[PDB]
Every structure is written in structure tokens, then in C-alpha cells.
Amino acid sequence: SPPSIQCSVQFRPCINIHKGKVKQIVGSTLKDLDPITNFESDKSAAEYATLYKQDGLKGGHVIMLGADPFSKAASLEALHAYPGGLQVGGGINSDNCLSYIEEGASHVIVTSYVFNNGQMDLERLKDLVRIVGKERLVLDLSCRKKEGKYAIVTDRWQKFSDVSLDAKVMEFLANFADEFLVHGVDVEGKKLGIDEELVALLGKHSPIPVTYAGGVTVMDDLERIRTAGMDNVDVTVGSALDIFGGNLAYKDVVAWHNQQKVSVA
Ligand SMILES: NC(=O)c1ncn([C@@H]2O[C@H](COP(=O)(O)O)[C@@H](O)[C@H]2O)c1/N=C/N[C@@H]1O[C@H](COP(=O)(O)O)[C@@H](O)[C@H]1O
Ligand SMILES: [Cl-]
Ligand code: NA
């Protein structure tokens, strides 16, 4: 709870593009293998990107949710507005991963492509690193408590894998990923608070930077990210931000992000 001169928890914004529009939803209600929608807008994804660039927020992510091809064009708008500022995910694979780097993304975020038959596919994973480099790959290990563990979920969170999120998995995938992104899908988009157990896990055993996402609702929940995460876990807020129809002031969340860069001088 008291500040840290060494560590600084980053706010990592998001842009959730579904069927061509910017939305925030309860992602666990997507059934495309109607989702509960928290917010829709016709504002171009490029305007959210420009806002983040203005406030110096780096390492946020654009998600192309679903197969609709108009989501691809809206994502390139945001990446073109904020070159190098955004990670981009949503159906990244071997054949298109490099293309997203060449459109201004700093990273691609991957889950489903590196999973086959419920297992981590080592050869697919090595193909990403070969093409884009580990430094431009983010692995998303979003998960859901199942039989006492955190099972990783694939295919837009509509399939349980057979890999559980634990220390041994993170030590291994860290040889292939610059960073980890982890949604607590049970609580995601539902504006009810966060998963403290998952954040505590991510902060104890992740050897590379890890962003938690899901259910951040009030400013006090940002202080739990610090507390449970031992100042090791970055945090995403989506459905609660006032710019996505919530009650949480985006400007307050930015101020909190800058308050974490504590300088003695
Ligand atoms: N059903 C889904 O919604 C879904 N499924 C997968 N993704 C992401 O897409 C990316 C690519 O996955 P693959 O296509 O490679 O499997 C990965 O990062 C996935 O986690 C999904 N979308 C996540 N959306 C994010 O949920 C967060 C909101 O938080 P909140 O404060 O609580 O409102 C923000 O990060 C939103 O952009
Ligand atoms: Cl699979
Ligand atoms: Na959401």
C-alpha cells in the first residue's frame, strides 16, 4: 500500500473492437464458436489511440474480437494513430503476425494459435518467435478457476485448455514472450471487482512483465492490484472507464498511473 521508489505499476489501456465498432462487453458472454454489451460507439478507434498517446500511456492493447473483417480496418486506424504505442491481438497466427508489426504495433498478443488439442503447441510457438521475435510477442494466458487451479482458456474464452496457469508454465513461456497478458475472465466486464487470487499468483510467479485485466471498478481496486500484486502486475480497466460508459474517471486513472513514477528528486 505505501509507495515504491523501485517499482511503478503501469496503467495499460485497451481498445475492444467488435464487428467494426469500439465496445466493452462481458467477454465471457461471447458465443461465436449475443454478448452482453456494456457500451457501443461510432467514435473511430483512432480517437482512443490519440488520447492514450497524448497521456503517454504505453503498452496498451487493441483487441479485434470476432472474425468480422471490418474490425481489422478499425485496428489499423488505431495503430496508425499511435505507432509503436499499442499491442494488438485477436486471431494472430503464423501467416499474419509480422504484418501487424509492420502496421505500427509494438507487439502481437496471441493465445489460440499456440494451442492445439488443449496443449501448448511448441512448434507453433517457435514459429511466432522465428517470424516476429520474442520481444514483439505477448502471450495471453487468460484463465478461469477450475478444480482448484487456473485453467487457461482459448478460442475467445469459449474452450478450456488442458494447461493450467502456474509457476512452471510462466517460467517456460517466458522464453517466448516479452510480456504476459492475463484476463480474469470470470470477473471480466462485470464491474464487480477483481480476482485477487489471480493477481497474487501473477505477481508471485511471473518472471516477465504481466498485465492483469478484468473487473477493475473503483480506484480502491487499483490499490489492490499493487497490494496483491506486490507492485509487479500492470492493470487494464475497460468497462468501468467513463470513456466506455462507466463511472471511473479515465483522467483519475491516468493521474494514478503517473503517481506511481515516484522520484526521490
Ligand atoms: N471473449 C472475449 O472478450 C475475448 N476473448 C479473447 N480476447 C482477447 O483477444 C486476444 C487474442 O486472443 P486469441 O484470438 O489469439 O485467442 C487475447 O488478449 C484475448 O484475451 C477477448 N477480449 C478481451 N477484451 C478485453 O477485456 C478487457 C476489459 O476488462 P474489464 O475492465 O473487466 O472490462 C480489455 O482488455 C478488453 O479489450
Ligand atoms: Cl486447442
Ligand atoms: Na470488457
Report the CATH number that the domain containing residue 247 is assigned in CATH: 3.20.20.70
- Grid cell 468501468 is found at 240
117 alpha carbon – ligand 3 mean position (Å): 27
Could you count the other beta carbons within 10 Å of the beta carbon of residue 8?
15
How many independent structural domains does the chain possess?
Answer: 1
Give the Cα separation of 63 and 207 in Å (integer): 24
In-domain check, residue 71:
yes
- Sign for the pseudo-dihedral over CA of 214, 219, 225, 228: negative
Q: What share of the chain is helix, strand, coil (3-state, %, to 5)?
A: 35, 25, 40
Closest by CA position to 105, among listed 70, 142, 141, 133:
133
- Could you give the strand order of the β-sheet that contains 143-146, starting from the edge strand earlier in sequence? 143-146, 149-154, 159-164
Residue with CA closest to ligand 1 atom 36: 16
Method: X-ray
Q: Which ligand is nearest to the CA of 121?
A: 2
In-domain check, residue 8:
no
Closest by CA position to 109, among listed 64, 140, 149:
140
190 alpha carbon – ligand 3 mean position (Å): 8
In-domain check, residue 84:
yes
Give the Cα separation of 145 and 160 in Å (integer): 10
Task: Look up the domain containing 129 and give its range.
Answer: 14-259
Closest by CA position to 173, among listed 106, 128, 240, 227:
128
In-domain check, residue 264:
no
In-domain check, residue 7:
no
Q: Cβ(112) to ligand 1 under 6 A?
A: yes
CB 114 within 8 Å of CB 85: no
Say which amino acid occupies 99: S
The phi and psi torsions of 136 (rounded to 5 degrees) equal -120, 30
Q: Which ligand is nearest to the CA of 159?
A: 2
In-domain check, residue 159:
yes
Q: What is the resolution of this structure in A?
A: 2.4
Q: Cβ(92) to ligand 1 under 6 A?
A: yes
Distance of CA 138 to the CA centre of its chain: 9
